[PDB]
Amino acid sequence: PPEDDGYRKPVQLYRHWVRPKFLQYKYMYNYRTNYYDDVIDYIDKKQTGVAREIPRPQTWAERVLRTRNISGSDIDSYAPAKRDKQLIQTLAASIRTYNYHTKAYINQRYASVL
């Protein structure tokens, strides 16, 4: 249908007025920063003396995983809690190991006949 179209039509909707700016959206900024993050990281830690291999180019999915690694990890990090809670009862059992002990074996007699 849009073959004999030429241009993309003049201005419309003059009287009502629409189109507030909507100037910024977050993930677009994330993508823009993503396209340069690896190279800027490489260079600015290069002046610090720490070494890294060449910034191999990354694909879009690779870029998104990179972004999640640099952003999702920062916003989502709750590793320590359940581990120590689970270790709590193991330690409690470790104290509880007394259980009156005693009896046992390889412990009998006093004879010196060898």
Swiss-Prot record:
Organism the protein comes from:
Drosophila melanogaster
* Biological process terms in GO annotation: adult somatic muscle development; oscillatory muscle contraction; sarcomere organization; striated muscle myosin thick filament assembly
Keyword Ligase tagged: no
Q: Which domain of life is it from?
A: Eukaryota
Its function, per the record, reads: Possibly involved in the regulation of flight muscles contraction, possibly by modulating actin-myosin interaction.
Please state what the protein is called.
Flightin
Keywords for the protein's UniProt record, in alphabetical order: Muscle protein, Phosphoprotein
Q: Which gene encodes it?
A: fln
Q: Which GO terms describe its cellular component?
A: A band; striated muscle myosin thick filament
Query: Where in the full protein does the shown chain start and end, and how long is the full protein?
Result: 69 to 182 of 182
Expressing tissues: Found only in indirect flight muscles (IFM).
GO molecular function term, any single one: structural constituent of muscle
Kindly provide the PTM information from the record.
Several forms of flightin are thought to be produced through post-translational modifications, possibly by phosphorylation.
